[PDB]
Write a protein that binds this ligand. Structure first.
Ligand SMILES: O=P(O)(O)OC[C@H](O)CO
Length: 294
């Protein structure tokens, strides 16, 4: 049985590594019965298209992030700005009650089942000088850019390399995995560490397709998703260290916001939670659960 999975990231990036590991593990556990074909880097379209294709069952699985907030506002809270103190905090929440609260009701709305949660990494600024900034076209990001006084230029990730090459935008903010993967520092060499948001993605599965399988097969899929997520949680920290080094080796600079700007981002981050209180019925409970794991 072939499972087609689409994603949005290049090879060597944690989402994509995750996808392959899931594939490797699932073949293992199911004894060669299931094979997974991985289509990363928007090969089967960008997020809106491949999410829709997965909802329809045209493909069985997809890897993405808070893009699915379009279908279920609470999903945005997977990337609540300023919510987690570090990766370990976020992992406790994401393997615990916080994820459960966020995911309640999602499948009913979407036709998708969220199988795991794993990080791509904290977002840091990249720019030509230490401003037309790229932002993802997702509400939580356009809102947050505003609160930061940033002039946001919404565009899908797939368009980022051309946008950089084209030379009108001055920067953006991304996980280090993405900054290094796209060699952003060659064009926008100045990175400022902020970590205002931790990017969290998931492997999603067409729910109809999933529930059509034997309870045993469902278990192997679930175990493969868990193992794969566990691997990614364990590799991002080490990778960000090497990424930071790499930037500093290759004419890149790393900066430290100033007290004054750090404060400006935190407040911006806290203000941006109105978006969730406005849009997510159980926002306070979700926030409370995350705080319980601190
Ligand atoms: O990946 P980006 O840079 O488009 O940011 C959007 C995140 O993937 C949302 O989870």
């Amino acid at each position: 049985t072939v499972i087609k999975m689409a994603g949005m990231k290049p090879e060597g990036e944690p989402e994509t590594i995750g996808m392959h590991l899931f594939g490797k593990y699932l073949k293992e556990l199911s004894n060669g019965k299931y094979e997974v074909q991985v289509f990363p880097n928007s090969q089967l379209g960008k997020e809106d298209a491949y999410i829709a294709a997965t909802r329809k069952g045209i493909i069985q699985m997809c890897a993405t992030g808070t893009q699915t907030s379009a279908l279920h506002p609470a999903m945005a809270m997977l990337e609540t700005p300023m919510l987690f103190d570090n990766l370990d905090h976020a992992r406790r929440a994401m393997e615990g009650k916080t994820f459960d609260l966020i995911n309640e009701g999602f499948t009913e709305k979407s036709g998708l089942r969220t199988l795991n949660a794993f990080p791509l990494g904290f977002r840091h600024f990249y720019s030509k000088k230490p401003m037309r900034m790229r932002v993802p076209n997702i509400p939580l990001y356009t809102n947050f850019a505003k609160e930061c006084g940033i002039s946001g230029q919404p565009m899908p990730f797939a368009e980022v390399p051309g946008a950089l090459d084209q030379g009108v935008i001055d920067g953006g903010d991304s996980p280090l995995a993405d900054i290094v993967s796209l060699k952003m520092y060659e064009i926008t060499p100045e990175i400022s560490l902020s970590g205002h948001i931790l990017v969290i993605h998931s492997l999603y599965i067409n729910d109809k397709f999933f529930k059509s399988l034997p309870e045993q097969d469902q278990k192997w899929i679930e175990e493969a998703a868990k193992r794969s997520a566990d691997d990614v949680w364990a590799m991002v920290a080490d990778g960000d260290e090497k990424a930071k080094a790499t930037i500093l080796a290759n004419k890149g600079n790393i900066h430290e916001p100033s007290k004054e700007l750090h404060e400006h981002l935190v407040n911006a981050g806290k203000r941006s939670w109105k978006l969730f209180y406005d849009t997510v019925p159980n926002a306070q409970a979700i926030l409370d659960s995350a705080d319980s794991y601190r």
